[PDB]
């Protein structure tokens, strides 16, 4: 009778069992234990016989050394780096071709050629980079690119599926950029394979903009050049510096923003676009020898300064844009006429210089990389394992299911809390909030009389109809708090001075949904209702242990009540002779006034003990005139004010001294035949109240224990799953500086295995 | 012009007149003044004599003074009599023309012979005749009938108008009597003229059954009885007996009843249904011609007639009896063996005994029945001499306007209540609510880390959240209770001896109507959220006087508090030596495993002071083998409870000395330059506490001042509206015994008014 709902739960827990046992626990135990292992193991078996097929479009399996895949694993590793940290503080370390110049240039030509003529949006009238695009260029068929990562399947060569996959990399060029700029950081991934792509990541970073038109947000060139540090910062960068060919050298942006990061040429090749503009206006080839030689190029850029010719025209095909380039070169005195041979100037020249420049690069760096993730590890883990010494390995994982059990544990401990504490906390927090107003609204205004019949009278059809509209009403809230306060209590109070802290966000956060899920039952009051009127309709009260317990609880509620009332009184007066000389203090004019008028209240109560609490306007006009003939001119109310707390304290004394006698005189056995005019009718009205609320406790606890404490439990399980599914709570909740330096360790060892990953992958040429 | 009553009472004449050209008296300008000229056209008319002469005329004597002066207003003075008395012990002087007998048929018909109209419910094998109905007969223009109340004029030459009456007596038949039974004493009325009828007033009452069958309620025939006695036993009524006449004589069922009630024959006539039957010798002509005689009755009678009627039918002309009295009498056995005397055969002379001696009755006894109207009103007027010098005809009207202005001036007064004591109230109420939750809840739990600023952090972090979802709708709660605790204290008793009680029925319908129809402001708790978050955020304080005062402030609490705890950890281990050896107690086995429990908790205690409120359970091991060693067995929750009562009653006396340290010390000079050992936080956090319940007190008695009160106000007008228009409900809340006293006086009077004018009449007509 203690709990009934753990009971419930076991029962049917058993019944389910013995039902369908032998289907849970092939499903609940076996196949899960089973199921981490084949996942390793027959897994395995499916995966090598598509990735076999896969393979074979690689052509790796035929070919040793050689598979398009190949360059994806390159790729594979700095997708990790990036989202493990896409900060300065990696991304400045990782190789990578940039395309960088000015943005009128065109720039993003020397890739738009091989497969970004295709599905990036292109052609002049605005400025299309938003965002570094990075595209990883692979050898093999026709293939639709990857879209930030994510698969599609559409037709390279058609232009119906073309335009869509154009939209796909706008949507993210625009959405990367945010109010008060129009360009953005944050990357765009893109992977395609066709013929003539080579094996390289190169990235067309925002084009470079001298100055901020009204037509763009002021921090449009400040944001690039924050941008344009990929490449200035990193020294595993290859640059490919394009000059516009439509305008001078002497012009340009990129010749500081590269002389700034290698100014000896050694990270970067320069190339030019456009130089078929020279012939649109008087061409001046003795500039174009010193474009050849760099002597108008501060970065002195290294290797053969290709040239990136075109129509113009936004729709030219990728065939026909090398077409065009290379009759252009082969007869243009631009190149003929000067020292730039067109096999070497050609775009394809470049890509398989550039492609030669990028495996140099990567092969001489990367190994420096996985001593440096390495020795970040062992630095990381030195520092978080002394700090955290508990903790060895931890994952933000483990940490909220850790919670999660240790919530449903504490709230189901909260089940376990005994009837003697609900009923006694309900018992006493409730009367507490009660106590006053039957006290202050129903018998002091009772004991005006001395009817005894009418004093009971007046309290019954009081409380019945006060019965009906608050008790209930006030006692389930009180229990409604008082499940939830000890259920705080369970749920973040700290176990002395060890405590986790880093659980403490998630346990409100449940807490919140819990209680705006927890609707104490709407019938509850009912049941109150009718409980609470038998509790008071029955006053019969045989038995003197009640009658001794009832009086010695309703004399702590009046010597409570006096003390408050003698507290303000004493404010209301200010301190006596005693006090004035002990410490050096004086009344207040007021307080003169209060003890004066005090005095002449009291005086007037000494004779008449029994003057009702109300007084007439002639025993205000009395004290006035009193207090004037003594000096004191007095509102009259200051002397009601005064009035009403004086009397109470003459009151209470009466009553308590009234209390002392109904015990003690009864005590007496002789005094038992005695039948003084000692009714103690306020015991029996609070010995009513008494049982009446011990009574109205234990309804609730019997509600609190059989269904509200298991509706908090039923709630506080759909909200922790809700959490468990609510991954950006989980991680806004567990902010411990442990796990998340936990976290990272586990990406810097997976970033280990992928460094090595490529770095063996390396090592397959011996 | 700083303190000085010149700019108040300049101030408050200019919102006075603001006032007075507001909306409430604007509005009057178009609803009252303008229907001025229709009230003085109205006085006009009322100062014409020309209404009082034709109320003279048409009221008195319309140039009829005995059939119109005194008939109609006979029937007005039965009314207002029965009006007054229900019972008939006041009517003996009054007579009626009384129609009792059995359920014979020629029961209507008797009462059609003399209301020469067709104006009863007719009806075959039933007994129609429900509930007594009373009939005015007088001289007027032919055929002209009314019925009382239905503002309606009747034809008695139209079968519509006929049926309507019939149809009208028979649904307030319907109406008076209740479910299971057929009869009801309530009377039906009506005023029919014609030159065939006399000056007499007639009541159809339901025939005696003396048995009940087909369902119908046993209490059928005893209510019969009662309708039918009401007025036989009227010393002055004329009683006629409506005799079945297809039985023997041997059946009859209600000459047992006037032979008792009329055994000197001064007022009881019977009368023989179904003559026809005579003459067919269906019925004994023999006990028939005895009848007529009057050999066969077992009393003294006032006369016999003959009922000439047939069967016929509904629609049969009262000419029909003339027919009849022709051809029964000229071809039967009642002339040819003259059993029947010729004038028992005219119902006229049945019509004409009945209304000469009638009015002879009325004239011989009515006068007398001022004897006991006087000594009635005497003994009212006596009785309010003695007790109610002060009483007057304080009926539903008077003591409802009283009552009614009593507590409008009351609720007034409520408004006019100081906000001293508004906000003094409001924030002991508040405090009274809230501090034991600020003291479990927070304070407590934040006490068990040693780091004041995280203790800070976590307090104010639940203070905002209890502020965002709690402490303002307990303020509103607050200030909605204490606005109601007042308005009954106006409206309740005065806590004297001088109330009249009389008017507590209305004060408090009043008092629940108005505060059940009042709603609080919507939005005063987002203003309360807001005040009490910048309050919080206020924790400046400067002054010691603010330290000193929440110092004692949250001491008091924590005294009461610590006393509570006391007094159950009393309870749990008994009463010391102290009491055992003086007052012959001693301490339960769970009491004084309690106290050795305690004693060891004290004893850890007394070697970690600072010990945190949460135990481990190898420490309730150890206080459990330690109890062993002592003989002491206990469960691991009695040492947690033990443990909860006396640590916290530790921490509270380790608080309370921290209190007396803090006020030895200050926020800012404890801290800066100083050895300090206090580090005083809970002042800080108490005073703020004291701000903001005495800034949401403010606000409250703001709020309440501005809006609640007058909108409290407004409803107590509107019920008490609602109370004036509800007749009933002033009906119930009046019956104050004084009331009734009055209603009784003014009845009396009224009824003594009538008759003087109506004897006055009688004499006339001598
Ligand atoms: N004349 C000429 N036009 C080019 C060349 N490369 C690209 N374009 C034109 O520039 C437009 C878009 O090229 P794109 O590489 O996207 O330059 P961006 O949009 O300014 O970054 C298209 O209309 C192309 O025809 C080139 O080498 N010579
Ligand atoms: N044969 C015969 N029929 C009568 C006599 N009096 C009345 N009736 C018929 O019976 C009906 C009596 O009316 P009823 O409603 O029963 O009177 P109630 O029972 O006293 O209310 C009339 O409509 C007549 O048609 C009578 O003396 N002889
Ligand atoms: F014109 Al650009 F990136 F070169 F938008
Ligand atoms: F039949 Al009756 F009164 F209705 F005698
Ligand atoms: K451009
Ligand atoms: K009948
Ligand atoms: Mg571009
Ligand atoms: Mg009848």
Redo the contacts with the bound molecule.
Sequence with gaps: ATDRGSESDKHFRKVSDKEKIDQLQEELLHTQLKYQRILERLEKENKELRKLVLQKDDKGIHHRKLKKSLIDMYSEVLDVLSDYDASYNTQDHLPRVVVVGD???????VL??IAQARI?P???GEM??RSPVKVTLSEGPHHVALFKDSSREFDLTKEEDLAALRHEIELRMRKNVKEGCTVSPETISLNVKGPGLQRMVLVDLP?VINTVTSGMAPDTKETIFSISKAYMQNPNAIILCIQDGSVDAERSIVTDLVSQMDPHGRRTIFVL?????AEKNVASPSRIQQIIEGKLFPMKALGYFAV???????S?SIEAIREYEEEFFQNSKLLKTSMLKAHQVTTRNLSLAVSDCFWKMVRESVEQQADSFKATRFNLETEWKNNYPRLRELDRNELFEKAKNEILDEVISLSQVTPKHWEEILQQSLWERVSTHVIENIYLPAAQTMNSGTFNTTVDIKLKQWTDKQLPNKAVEVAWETLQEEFSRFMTEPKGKEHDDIFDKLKEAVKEESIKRHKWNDFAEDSLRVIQHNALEDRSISDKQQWDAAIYFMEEALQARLKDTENAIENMVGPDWKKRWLYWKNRTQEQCVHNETKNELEKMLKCNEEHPAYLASDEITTVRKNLESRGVEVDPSLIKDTWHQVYRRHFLKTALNHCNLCRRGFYYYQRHFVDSELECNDVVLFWRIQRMLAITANTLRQQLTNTEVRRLEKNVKEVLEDFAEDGEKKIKLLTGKRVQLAEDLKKVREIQEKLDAFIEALHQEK
């Design positions: 943005q009128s240039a065109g720039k993003t030509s738009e050629m990036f292109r052609g002049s299309m980079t084009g676009t456009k130089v078929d503009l990136v010719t075109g129509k113009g025209n936004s030219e």
